[PDB]
Amino acid sequence: HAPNQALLRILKETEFKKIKVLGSGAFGTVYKGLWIPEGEKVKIPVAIKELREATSPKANKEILDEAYVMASVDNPHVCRLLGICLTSTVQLIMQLMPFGCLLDYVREHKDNIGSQYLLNWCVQIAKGMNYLEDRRLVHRDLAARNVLVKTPQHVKITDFGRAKLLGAEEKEYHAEGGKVPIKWMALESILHRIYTHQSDVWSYGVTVWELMTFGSKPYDGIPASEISSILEKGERLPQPPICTIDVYMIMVKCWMIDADSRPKFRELIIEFSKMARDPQRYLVIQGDERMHLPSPMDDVVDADEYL
Ligand SMILES: *[C@@H](CC(=O)Nc1cc2c(Nc3ccc(OCc4ccccn4)c(Cl)c3)c(C#N)cnc2cc1OCC)CN(C)C
């Protein structure tokens, strides 16, 4: 198949500044900062991940494989890697997404999120996923926690730590063991470790459900080990209070046992987009019409305008 001609940019440590810690994990620390390429008179808001010293050879390998994947995607609804830096520990430089993860955003701003935003986000995530399908990439971890918010009007899919580029002739990815987000996974993934674009569609439905409930936990209080039999008995997540049957039927279709009967991402774009043209017909939110969310140094330029 086609040669992957993505460029991987190796950055110089003196070209970026850490301004503030965003978060700390077992992997390393994420900083908010600025990337200032020498002589270009530009300043790019970035998230910088610095791996800790104690990082194993195995962990470094997985981080570099994820970097390889992020360097190979280029779409307005998929997060962009600016580059990496090979200091004592590896640093990864991504576009800053100032409003954070979408799961938190909907929990924290629920009294101001109207139907127009919710449906637009559905369109955008469907576009990101359709692009990934075109690239023969299966994400395997789609969820509201893994969507980032550049502005309230513009979201992007992130976290390619489980993502697989399907082999040239390969139709499905077969996984081995590992720690899995059961409650977002298609039944064939839980039972048989099979992943396809159609299994990502299932996860998309669950992600939509998260948004429409303003960040409820799916199958809340139910242990992960009971999920597969609940699903086999035909039970699914409930209709969110704000959803018309039009929107709920779409989620339900994403949760069919027959993977080939689930909608395609290209059809999800179309359907949510029809609804986005008349949003109050499809989502019923009290005070919808009065809801407002935020909207937009000298040489600052967003990563999206730095090409
Ligand atoms: C959600 C809160 C939250 O997401 N906070 C954030 C996060 C970001 C991030 N996130 C991020 C993710 C991964 C990164 O690395 C990428 C990588 C590349 C190659 C190999 C391995 N890993 C980095 Cl560096 C960052 C980014 C990015 N990218 C940008 N901006 C963020 C902002 C932000 O909040 C700002 C208010 C909380 N959970 C509970 C759901």
Please report, for the chain, the start and end positions of each structural domain, with discontinuous segments joined by +.
Answer: 1-96, 97-299
Tell me which of 19, 94, 109 to substitute to probe ligand 1's pocket, judged by most ligand atoms within 8 Å of the beta carbon.
94
Nearest CA to ligand 1 atom 37: 101
| Angle of helix 197-212 versus helix 245-254 axis, rounded to 10 | 150
Which 3 state secondary structure label does DSSP give 290?
A: helix
CATH code linked to domain 97-299: 1.10.510.10
Whole-angstrom distance, CA of residue 201 vs CA of residue 204: 5
Resolution in A: 2.2
Ligand 1 center–CA 7 separation, angstroms: 22
DSSP the chain: --------PBPPGGGEEEEEEEEE-SSEEEEEEEE--TTS--BEEEEEEEE-TT--HHHHHHHHHHHHHHHT---TTB--EEEEEESSSEEEEEE--TT-BHHHHHHHSGGG--HHHHHHHHHHHHHHHHHHHHTTEE-S--SGGGEEEEETTEEEE---TT-EEPPTT-SSEEP-S----GGGS-HHHHHH-EE-HHHHHHHHHHHHHHHHTTSPPTTTT--GGGHHHHHHTT--PPPPTTB-HHHHHHHHHHT-SSGGGSPPHHHHHHHHHHHHTSGGGTB--TTGGG-------TTB--GGG--
| Angle of helix 245-254 versus helix 265-276 axis, rounded to 10 | 170
Nearest CA to ligand 1 atom 31: 97
Whole-angstrom distance, CA of residue 260 vs CA of residue 172: 13
Whole-angstrom distance, CA of residue 27 vs CA of residue 55: 7
Whole-angstrom distance, CA of residue 51 vs CA of residue 101: 21
Whole-angstrom distance, CA of residue 54 vs CA of residue 60: 10
Which 3 state secondary structure label does DSSP give 201?
A: helix
Contacts of 22 (CB under 8 A, 6+ apart): 30, 31, 32, 47
Whole-angstrom distance, CA of residue 241 vs CA of residue 158: 28
Domain 1-96 = CATH 3.20.20.120: no
Whole-angstrom distance, CA of residue 215 vs CA of residue 233: 25
Ligand 1: which atom is nearest the Cα of residue 93? 24
Please state how this structure was obtained.
Answer: X-ray
What is the helix (H) or strand (E) element at residue 258, kind and residue range? none
Ligand 1 center–CA 47 separation, angstroms: 7
Helices assigned H by DSSP within 102-235: 102-108, 115-134, 187-192, 197-212, 227-232
- 137 - beta bridge partners? 165
What is the amino acid identity at position 48? I
Whole-angstrom distance, CA of residue 253 vs CA of residue 262: 5
Return the active site residues.
Answer: 141
Q: For the CA atoms of the chain, what is the radius of gyration? A: 20
What is the amino acid identity at position 9? R
Tokens of 180: 């899995």
What is the amino acid identity at position 29? T
Q: Which of 16, 34, 42 minimizes the C-alpha distance to 298?
A: 42
Ligand 1: which atom is nearest the Cα of residue 145? 40
Which 3 state secondary structure label does DSSP give 225?
A: helix
Whole-angstrom distance, CA of residue 275 vs CA of residue 259: 24
Which 3 state secondary structure label does DSSP give 156?
A: strand
What is the amino acid identity at position 227? I
Q: Which of 15, 91, 22, 31 minimizes the C-alpha distance to 55?
A: 91
